């Protein structure tokens, strides 16, 4: 079951304050659904970088009083870990038709 997933070790996907260029280097050549979380160049915000159709996509993570997320009304998650675990089994497509992938493969899994 899902308890076995590498996502439960946050260090398999959270690469700290790595920038966009470093994320592109870490994800270059990786299979679709490989992802990481990192700080954004927008200070105080996080980003997901994920491979979709062989290309890296970068998504901002919002933080509201109800939690982290990608867009209202889904800013629900109390931590990055809860967000990642949710989107390991929920496609990002609900947010944008070009993001039909899950957060499937932590970069350091």
């Amino acid at each position: 079951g899902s308890e076995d997933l590498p996502h439960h070790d946050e260090k398999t996907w959270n690469v700290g304050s790595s920038n966009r260029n470093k994320a592109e280097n870490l994800l270059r050549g990786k299979r679709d659904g490989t992802f990481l979380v990192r700080e954004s160049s927008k200070q105080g915000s996080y980003a997901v970088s994920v491979v979709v159709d062989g290309e890296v996509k970068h998504l901002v993570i919002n933080k509201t009083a109800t939690g982290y997320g990608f867009a209202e009304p889904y800013n629900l998650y109390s931590s990055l870990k809860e967000l990642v675990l949710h989107y390991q089994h929920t496609s990002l497509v609900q947010h944008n038709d070009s993001l039909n992938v899950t957060l499937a493969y932590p970069v350091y899994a």
Binding site: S41, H58, L59, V60, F70, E72, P73, H95, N96, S98
Partner: peptide, 8 residues
């Protein structure tokens, strides 16, 4: 940089 837009 450019981020993918995620409308509410």
């Amino acid at each position: 940089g450019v981020y993918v837009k995620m409308p509410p």
